[PDB]
Amino acid sequence: LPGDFGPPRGEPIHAVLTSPPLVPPPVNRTYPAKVIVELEVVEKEMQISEGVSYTFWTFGGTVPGSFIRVRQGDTVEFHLKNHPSSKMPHNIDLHGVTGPGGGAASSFTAPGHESQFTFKALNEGIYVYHCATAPVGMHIANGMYGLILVEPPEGLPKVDHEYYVMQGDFYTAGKYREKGLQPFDMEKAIDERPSYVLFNGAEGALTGDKALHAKVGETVRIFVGNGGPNLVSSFHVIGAIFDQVRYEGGTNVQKNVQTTLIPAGGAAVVKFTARVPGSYVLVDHSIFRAFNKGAMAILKIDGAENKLVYSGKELDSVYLGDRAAPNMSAVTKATQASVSGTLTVQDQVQAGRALFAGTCSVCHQGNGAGLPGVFPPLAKSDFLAADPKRAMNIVLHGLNGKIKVNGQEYDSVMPPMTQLNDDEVANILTYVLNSWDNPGGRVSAEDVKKVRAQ
Amino acid sequence: LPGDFGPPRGEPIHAVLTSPPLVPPPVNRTYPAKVIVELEVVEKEMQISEGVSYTFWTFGGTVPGSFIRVRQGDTVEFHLKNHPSSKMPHNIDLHGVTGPGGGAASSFTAPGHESQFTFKALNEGIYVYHCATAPVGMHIANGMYGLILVEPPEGLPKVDHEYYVMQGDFYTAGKYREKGLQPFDMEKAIDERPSYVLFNGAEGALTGDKALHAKVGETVRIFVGNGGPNLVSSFHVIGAIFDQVRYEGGTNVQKNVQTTLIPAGGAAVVKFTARVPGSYVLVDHSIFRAFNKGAMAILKIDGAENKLVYSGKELDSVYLGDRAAPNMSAVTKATQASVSGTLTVQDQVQAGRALFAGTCSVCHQGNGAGLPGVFPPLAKSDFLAADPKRAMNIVLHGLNGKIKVNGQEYDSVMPPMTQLNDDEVANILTYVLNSWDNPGGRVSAEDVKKVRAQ
Amino acid sequence: LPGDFGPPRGEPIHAVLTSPPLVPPPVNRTYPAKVIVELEVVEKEMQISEGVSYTFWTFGGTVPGSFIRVRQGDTVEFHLKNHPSSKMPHNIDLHGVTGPGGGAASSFTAPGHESQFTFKALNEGIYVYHCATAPVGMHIANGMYGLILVEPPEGLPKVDHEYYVMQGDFYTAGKYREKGLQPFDMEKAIDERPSYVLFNGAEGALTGDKALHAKVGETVRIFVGNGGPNLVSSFHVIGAIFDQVRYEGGTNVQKNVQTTLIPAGGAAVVKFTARVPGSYVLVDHSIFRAFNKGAMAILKIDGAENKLVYSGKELDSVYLGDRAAPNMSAVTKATQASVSGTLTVQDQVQAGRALFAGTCSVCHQGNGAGLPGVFPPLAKSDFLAADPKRAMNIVLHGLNGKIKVNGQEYDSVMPPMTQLNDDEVANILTYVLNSWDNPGGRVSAEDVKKVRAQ
Numbered sequence A, B, C: 001l002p003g004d005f006g007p008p009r010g011e012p013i014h015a016v017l018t019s020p021p022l023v024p025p026p027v028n029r030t031y032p033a034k035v036i037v038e039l040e041v042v043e044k045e046m047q048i049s050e051g052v053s054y055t056f057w058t059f060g061g062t063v064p065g066s067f068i069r070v071r072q073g074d075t076v077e078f079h080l081k082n083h084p085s086s087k088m089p090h091n092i093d094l095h096g097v098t099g100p101g102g103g104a105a106s107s108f109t110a111p112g113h114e115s116q117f118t119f120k121a122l123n124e125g126i127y128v129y130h131c132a133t134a135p136v137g138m139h140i141a142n143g144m145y146g147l148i149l150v151e152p153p154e155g156l157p158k159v160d161h162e163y164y165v166m167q168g169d170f171y172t173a174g175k176y177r178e179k180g181l182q183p184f185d186m187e188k189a190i191d192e193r194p195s196y197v198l199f200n201g202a203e204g205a206l207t208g209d210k211a212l213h214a215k216v217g218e219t220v221r222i223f224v225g226n227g228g229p230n231l232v233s234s235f236h237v238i239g240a241i242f243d244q245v246r247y248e249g250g251t252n253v254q255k256n257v258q259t260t261l262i263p264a265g266g267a268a269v270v271k272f273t274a275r276v277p278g279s280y281v282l283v284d285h286s287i288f289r290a291f292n293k294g295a296m297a298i299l300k301i302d303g304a305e306n307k308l309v310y311s312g313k314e315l316d317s318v319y320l321g322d323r324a325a326p327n328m329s330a331v332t333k334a335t336q337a338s339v340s341g342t343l344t345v346q347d348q349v350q351a352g353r354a355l356f357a358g359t360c361s362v363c364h365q366g367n368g369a370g371l372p373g374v375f376p377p378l379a380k381s382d383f384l385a386a387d388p389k390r391a392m393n394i395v396l397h398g399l400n401g402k403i404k405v406n407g408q409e410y411d412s413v414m415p416p417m418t419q420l421n422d423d424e425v426a427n428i429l430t431y432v433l434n435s436w437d438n439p440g441g442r443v444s445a446e447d448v449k450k451v452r453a454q
C-alpha cells in the first residue's frame, strides 16, 4: 500500500483544527503518528448576507468546516460529535479515506451522540470532506463541508502565508438579498439554480476588512475547496496568475495559469507570488456568480508600486461594486431596525450609502454629479425632487428617452434594476434624497412594493 | 500519418461487441487487421426507473450502446443497420475517426436499411460514438451513444477486470420517479434541466445485485463515457482513489486523484486498485445528480478487512438510500398492479418497504423505533394511528413544533418531502401502517393527490 | 520577475489588431519593445441570427473584440477609447496583466473619453480580456470580450494558418430565432439559461461561406476563447483530433485529444493537422448548445480524398442542418420584408427553403419524396393539399397514428416542432406549398399564431 511508513510512533497527537480562512501549522514531523481528530457538528443561524439569516449545518461552527491537517502515513482516530441542540443526524465522508463511504457508515451520529472510526491516511493531497447523511444534497447545501490536508512525508515547500477558501452554492427560498431568515429551497437545489454562490459561507466573508493579506515579494498558498453541492468553479484570480495548481493528491501540477476548473467536491492547492500592491480577486469566472451571487474573495497585497510592471490604480467600486468598502454593516443594522419597528431615516441613509456604491455610482458618480450631458446628476437633482415616485419607477424599470435634468438634456438609457429588493430600492433612494442638497424625506419598502406591483 | 503500421494483414476479423457493463477481450494482436463491425439500431421501451418506461433509441439494444474494441492502425469496415421496427432514421459519428462527421454522412440509415463505410483507426484512445441525425440532441438524449476503444499497438497493461460505465442526462415530461411511459421533453433538454442523470441507462443499473465486482488486491480498469447530451460529470469514486485517469487518447495521464471532470461527449480510462472490502460508489459529484437523480454506480469489493487501513463498516441506506438493497423490484410490481387494477395491500407494503429505506429510515430507523426524545417512533405510533390523513400531510409538507408520540414530547423538524410522487407517499405509508403493530389499512395514490391539492 | 528581458528597445511599435477570425502576424522580434495598443469601444446593433438584431457592446466593432498580439517582456501602453455614440461607460480587464483588475481601475472611460495605462507583459500565453464595468455580467453578455496573445520570446512554432474563435453565451428576452431587436434578459443571464451559444458573435459566423479554410497536409492553430459570461465549453472537433491543447500560459500541454473543457473566461491554443478533405465542426459538445443554440463553427479542408483513411462523404444537412448551405440570407430578407410590409410569396418560399434543410429534409428528403411507407412525401402530397391548417398543427404539435398519403399507409411518429417560431413555420409551409406540384398559396405568421393559441 502507499503511505507504507510503518506503525505509528511517538506520542498520540491531538490535532489542532483551524477555522477558515486560517490553516493549522505544517505538521513538521518525520515519523507517522496516531492523530486524534475531534470535530463537532453545530446547527446554527448565521448571516449569509447582510440582514439575511440562514440555518447552517456546520462542522465546527463555520462554513467551510474546521481545517484538518495530517501527514501521509498517519493513523487518524476520527471522533465526530453532534451537538445536543441539533435536530438532524449527521456523519462524515472524508475524501482521501480508503474505505466505504470515506467513513460514512461508521460515523452516523444522532443529536447529543458521538461516533468514532480509525483510518490510515494512505493518500497525500488536499481533499474535501462532507456530510453523507440522506438527503445528502440537503446536508451539503446547508454548509456541511470542509478540507483535510494530508501532507507528503517531507512536508510542502515553505511559503509566507497559507489560507483556506472554499466555494459553495446555496439555495434560499427567497431571492438574492431578500431579507429575513431564508429556508433551504429543495426545488432550486435539484435544478442547480443557486441564489448565492459564496466563498466561506457568506457574502463579503473575504472582502473589505475580511480580505486575506500579504506583502509584495511574499508567497501565498491557498487551499481551495469546492463544496458544491452542484456547481463547478471556473476558479480565477483577477490581475494575477497562479504559479502552481495541483488538484487533490494528483501527480500532475499545472504551472502559470490564471483560470482553472474545480469539480464539485474537488479541491486544489494554488500558489501565488505577490508582485505589485493592490487587491487580487478570487472569483468563479462563471461571471454572474462572481458579480451577482457573491462569489468574490480578496487577497490584498501591501507594498511599493512598480510602475515598470503596472502603472495603474487599486480597485474600486466600478469593478468590486458594494464590496470595495470595508463592510456593509449599515445594511445589517437597517434590516434589524426594520424588524424591531425602529427604522430611522438615518438607518436608511447609511444602508443606502453602502448599496449605492457600484450599483448607482458607476454612472452617477460617488458624489452624484454624473457627467454633464452623459449621465445626469443625482446631486441637487430637480428631476428627482419633482417626483419621488417616478424615481422608484426609474430604479425598478429603467429610464430612456430625452429628459431634462438641472437645465441639460440627456438622451440615454438607464437599465432596469428589478433584481433589487424593495428595502434596497427604498434605502438607496432615501440615501440619495438625504444627500447633496436633495429635499430629504424617505422612501419605504412598502412604497416600493406598491410601485413594483403597479 | 499516425497509426502507420502498414496494410491490413491476416484474415478479416468480425468484431465481437459487448453489452454494458462488459468489455470485449483485449485484441491481443501484433499486426493491423481489417475489422468488420456490425451494429444495429433498435428503438424500444425500457424501464428508466422502477415503473417508469421510456422509449430509448439504442445502438445494439442497450444504453450505452455496444462496446467496440479495435487496435490503432486497423482498417474498420463499419456496418450500421436500422431495425425495421424503427420510426426514425439514424447514423453514427465515432470520435476517433479521421473524416467529416466521424462517419455521419456515410451512415444515414432509414428504418429497415443498412449502410457501411470504412475508416482507418489512426488515433489510439477511448472515444464516444453517438448518433448524428438532426435533431442530434434528441437522438443522443434518447440513448444513442457508446464507446469505442482503439488500443495502442502493444495493448493496455493487463488488469484483473475491465468494465464499461457511461453517464447520461435524460429529459422526461414527468418528474423524477413519476410512473408510466414518459415522453422525451424537448423544453427540459434545451434548458439542460434533466429529470434523471444515470449510469448505463437506468436507475440502479449498477447498484445492489447489479454492482460491479472485484476482490481485495485486484486491479480494475473502467472505461468511463459521458454521453451527455448536456452535462459535464464531476466524476468521483467515494472511499477510494483512481490510480490513473487518462482522457481519450491524450498523452497526459493524471495519477492519484479522486474527482475528475469529464466533458459532455468525453471519455476516460480510470484504474482502481482494491485495498479494503466494501462498496465504492461512482458518482457525478454535482451531488443532487448522484443522490436525487440516479447518478450512482457501485464497485463492490470482497475480501478481508484491514483494520490498520479502515476500521469501519460497509455502506448502508444512510448514504446509499433505497439503493443499498439488492433491488427495488417491489416498486415495479406495484406499479404494474396499479396499471392492471389489481393493486393489493401487500403490493403496496412491499413497494413502500423498498422506498422507506433511507428516505424515512435515516431518522425513524429501519424498525421504526426512532430514537426516544429525538426522532419519534413510527412503530406502534399513537400519533400515526390517530390521523392517517395528517400523516400524508406530514410526508408532503413536513412537520415542526411540539408533539407527543407514545407518551414523549418531541420538538424538532421533519423536512417536507414534496418531491415524492403520490404513489410513493401512498406506498410508504401503507408499509408503515402494516408494520410494527400499526393498525393496517392503506393509503392510495388518489388519497395523496387530494391532500397535495388542498 | 518572469519576462525579465530588460528595458524596451528599438522603436515604439503601434500594434496592428485584427478582427475575428483573423490573427495579427507573428511578432517576429528578438528584443522587448514598447507596444502602443489602441482599442475603441463601439455599441451597435448587429444581427445575432438572421432577422434577429441585438445591441452589442464591442471592443473594436466585433464580437469577439480585436485580437492583440505582443511578446512576453514587452511594455504595453494601452489606450482605451469609448466612442461618442456610446451610452455606457466601459473599461478593460486583460487576463495576463500583473496588477489589480487587470487594468480595470485605470481604464474607466465614459462615452467620448479615452484612458490609458501601462503594463509589462510578464506572462506568456493566450488570455481573455473583457469589460470590468458594473454590472460586469451585463457588459460581458453584450459582447465585451476578446483575446490577447503574449508570445514566448522565441515565438510560437510556425503553422500554415492561425485563426481566432471565441465562444459566448447570450441572453435575449425572446426565444431562439424569434425575430426583431432583442433586448438583453437579465433574468435568463442570472439563471445561466442562454438563448444563444455562439462562436464569434452570431449564428453562422463561421459556417458555410464564412467557414475557416485550409488544405490537406497543412497545420492550423486556433486561438480559442470562452468569453462566457457563464458557460463552460466541452470544446470539441467533430471528425478530427487536436494535436495539442495548451491553456493560457500553462506549462502543461495535452496532446491527441478531441474534447477539452474550456472554463468561463478561459482560453486555449489548439493545433490541427489536416488529413482528409471535408468540413470539421468545432462545437460545444454540451450538444443542445451546438445543435439548438448556434454553437457550431467549420474548418473546411480542401484536397484529395484518401480512401485508406476515410471512405465516406462530406457533411450535409443531416448533421449540420440549415448550416450546411452557404448562408441563410433569404431569412434575413424575408424578415426585413415583413417589417416593411412587403413580404411576397417568393420571399417566404426562399426563406422556407433555407429553413427546410435539416429541420424537415432529414425525414422528408430535400426533394420532398420521403421514403415510401416510412416517411410520407411532401412532394405532390394529397394529405398536405387537403388541409393546410392541419399541416400547421402537424408542424407545431407533431403527428402520429395511421394516415394515408398518396395512396400509401404510414404508421409512424413525427415529433412536435414547437420551438419553431410563427414566421418559421409559415415560411417553411409556404416553401412546401410552392414546390413539387403542390397547390401554392401561402401560410402567414398570423395563421400560425392562431393555431398555436388554439
Ligand code: HEC
Pocket (backbone or CB within 6 Å): A356, A358, A359, A360, A361, A362, A363, A364, A374, A375, A376, A377, A378, A381, A383, A384, A391, A394, A395, A399, A400, A401, A402, A403, A405, A410, A411, A412, A413, A414, A415, A417, A428, A429, A432, C088
Ligand atoms: C449607468 C448604467 C446607470 C446606472 C448604473 C444607474 N443609472 Fe440612473 N440614470 C442613468 C441614465 C443614463 C439616466 C438618464 C436616462 C435618459 O432617459 O437619458 C439615468 C437617470 C436617473 C434618474 C432620473 C434623472 C436624474 O435625477 O438624474 C434617477 C433618479 C436615477 N437615474 C437614479 C439612479 C439610481 C438611484 C441608481 C442606482 C440604484 C441608478 N440611477 C443607476 C444611468 C444609470
Ligand code: HEC
Pocket (backbone or CB within 6 Å): A088, B356, B358, B359, B360, B361, B362, B363, B364, B374, B375, B376, B377, B378, B381, B383, B384, B391, B394, B395, B399, B400, B401, B402, B403, B405, B410, B411, B412, B413, B414, B415, B417, B428, B429, B432
Ligand atoms: C429526519 C430528517 C426525518 C426523516 C427523513 C423523516 N422524518 Fe418523519 N419525523 C421526523 C421528526 C423530527 C418528526 C417530529 C417533528 C416534530 O414536530 O417534532 C417526525 C414526525 C413524523 C410523523 C409524526 C409522528 C410519529 O408518528 O412519529 C410521521 C408519521 C412521520 N414523521 C413519518 C415519516 C415518513 C413516512 C418518512 C419517510 C417518507 C419520514 N417521516 C421521514 C424526522 C424525519
Ligand code: HEC
Pocket (backbone or CB within 6 Å): B088, C356, C358, C359, C360, C361, C362, C363, C364, C374, C375, C376, C377, C378, C381, C383, C384, C391, C394, C395, C399, C400, C401, C402, C403, C405, C410, C411, C412, C413, C414, C415, C417, C428, C429, C432
Ligand atoms: C422525421 C423525424 C420527421 C421530420 C424531421 C419531419 N417530419 Fe413530417 N412527418 C414525419 C412522419 C413519420 C410523418 C407521418 C406520421 C404518421 O402519423 O405516420 C410526417 C407527416 C407529415 C405531414 C403530413 C403527411 C404528408 O403530407 O406527407 C406533413 C405536412 C409534414 N410531416 C410536414 C413536415 C414539415 C414541414 C417538417 C419540417 C418543419 C417535418 N414534417 C419534419 C416525419 C418527419
Ligand SMILES: [Cu+2]
Pocket (backbone or CB within 6 Å): A057, A088, A089, A090, A091, A131, A132, A133, A139, A144
Ligand atoms: Cu449532516
Ligand SMILES: [Cu+2]
Pocket (backbone or CB within 6 Å): A093, A095, A128, A130, A265, B285
Ligand atoms: Cu464526496
Ligand SMILES: [Cu+2]
Pocket (backbone or CB within 6 Å): B057, B088, B089, B090, B091, B131, B132, B133, B139, B144
Ligand atoms: Cu439516431
Ligand SMILES: [Cu+2]
Pocket (backbone or CB within 6 Å): B093, B095, B128, B130, B265, C285
Ligand atoms: Cu460527438
Ligand SMILES: [Cu+2]
Pocket (backbone or CB within 6 Å): C057, C088, C089, C090, C091, C131, C132, C133, C139, C144
Ligand atoms: Cu463595458
Ligand SMILES: [Cu+2]
Pocket (backbone or CB within 6 Å): A285, C093, C095, C128, C130, C265
Ligand atoms: Cu476575467
